[PDB]
From a paper:
The prosurvival protein [name]-1 prevents apoptosis by binding to the pro-death BCL-2 family proteins. The process of intrinsic apoptosis is governed by the B-cell lymphoma 2 (BCL-2) family of proteins, where dynamic binding interactions between pro-death (e.g., BIM, BAX, BAK, NOXA) and prosurvival factors (e.g., BCL-2, BCL-XL, [name]-1) ultimately dictate if a cell will undergo programmed cell death. The large, hydrophobic, shallow binding groove of [name]-1 has presented substantial challenges for identifying effective small-molecule inhibitors of this protein.
This molecule possessed the physicochemical and pharmacokinetic properties consistent with the desired profile of a short-lived IV-administered compound. Herein we describe the generation and characterization of the highly potent and selective macrocyclic molecule [name]-467. The macrocyclic core structure of [name]-467 serves to orient the molecule into a highly active conformation; this is evidenced by the reported target affinity and potency against [name]-1-dependent cell lines, as well as the durable in vivo efficacy observed following compound administration. [name]-467 is a potent binder of human [name]-1 (dissociation constant [Ki] values < 0.010 nM) and demonstrates lesser affinity (Ki values > 200 nM) toward the other BCL-2 family members BCL-XL, BCL-2, BCL-W, and BCL2-A1. Consistent with published reports of [name]-1 inhibitors, [name]-467 is highly selective for the target protein. Treatment of H929 cells with [name]-467 induced the classical hallmarks of apoptosis, including a dose-dependent loss in mitochondrial membrane potential, caspase-3/7 activation, and phosphatidyl serine externalization. In summary, the molecule [name]-467 is a highly potent and selective [name]-1 inhibitor that demonstrates robust inhibition of tumor growth in in vivo models of hematological malignancies.
Numbering used by the authors: -191 to 320
Write the structure that this text describes.
Amino acid sequence: GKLVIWINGDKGYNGLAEVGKKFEKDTGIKVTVEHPDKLEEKFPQVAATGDGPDIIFWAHDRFGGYAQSGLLAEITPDKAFQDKLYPFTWDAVRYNGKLIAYPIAVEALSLIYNKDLLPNPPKTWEEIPALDKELKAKGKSALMFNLQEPYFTWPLIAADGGYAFKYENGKYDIKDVGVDNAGAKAGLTFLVDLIKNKHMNADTDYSIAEAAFNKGETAMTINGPWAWSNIDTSKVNYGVTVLPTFKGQPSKPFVGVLSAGINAASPNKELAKEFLENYLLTDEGLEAVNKDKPLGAVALKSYEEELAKDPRIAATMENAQKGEIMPNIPQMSAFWYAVRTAVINAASGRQTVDEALKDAQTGSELYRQSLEIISRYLREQATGAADTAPMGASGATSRKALETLRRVGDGVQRNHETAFQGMLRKLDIKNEDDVKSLSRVMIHVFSDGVTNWGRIVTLISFGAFVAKHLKTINQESCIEPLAESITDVLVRTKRDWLVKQRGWDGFVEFFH
Ligand SMILES: OC[C@H]1O[C@H](O[C@H]2[C@H](O)[C@@H](O)[C@@H](O)O[C@@H]2CO)[C@H](O)[C@@H](O)[C@@H]1O
């Protein structure tokens, strides 16, 4: 047995390695803390084939997409163990009724300022530009933060009223997507104004900013608790405080809760359980990681009660209280691409903020209408009857793509019925992981091949043959998770092709 733990390079990995070394001394078992590049991207590729780490570490927002793929194993955390962590932290790691990952710590962006340069932090975002005038006079910069990640810019975009998905009575509504509304256009406009008014360069990354503030070159930065240790080490006189206001209202950061999930493919499930509950999630386990790089408002009540007495944590918690817990819906991986692209094209000057935000909002519309078209076809091909409920935006286009899918998709199923049958029988998809396995196989078979409407219809028709065969054994709960993945490989990995082919209109045009 062994334990391979993947965790982001910005988190305390040497501290976690000390926790695994402490576990190593009591079990023999080697714990290996690797911190790979583009972790949120690499984990899904490897763990789909069943080649990942035993324990994965990321903010909860990506775990809901991992669970739909079946890249995660369900955790069995005893009734007594759950009472040791905060109820809201367990809620962040709950997907479709099931706890999929372990809550570690609540993370939220706070404003970090140098007390020597600024005796006080500015109450508003609108007073940061004129501060730069008086700070440049002394050879300095007023504010520098990561402009590459939309996580760092979201609190300004969300302050006046921008949002990912609205929380309609215990659920997210993918029809109500506010990345285009006036509050987002106003927030992002102020950021673009700072680059137009030379107050900020539209190329500052995590390292540029961490160097600048910690060297004493910039007056304030934006960051999470993980960055505290490097400021502490730089000996800079700093204060962590509430984020400034935009247009009178607070900056609402997206609030992530660092989670610890176990690969479903992994053969060290019970080993990861003892490691996570009995070793890591204890005051001494979290104090070891926290000593390397601060976690934030930790899930563990025992250690959080102590940690609460730190005004840096109180600022973090007040900022978390003024922001929102990020959704864990599968669309989130795709949502972030759309939004990173928008923040990067607005700052880079490649686009107007109305355009950059539109192509981003449009990206969610392609995801919604696509999940609607695909799932409708697939569900009606198992029941044998149409759904009569409305579809919203681009309704007549989605209506025609369905009557186009029924004609062309049933032609593919008919003309290739002999072949589809052999493929479905040569797989023995009996249980849910076997079905989710297929989801990934067709996802990568289509992708590692040419992108055209022919192959799209083929991939969807096979999905409808599968939806018919799922129904046969009553475990037809995988139809929508299958329909949402075919949407993902399409609007996520082939976004540009679909947009170049005039969306679903080009498909209805294609076959006539
Ligand atoms: O910026 C988009 C990005 O935001 C979040 O990632 C944060 C993460 O939560 C922090 O712990 C830290 O690692 O910084 C990241 C931003 O660089 C989402 O979790 C992530 O999925 C998303 O792509």
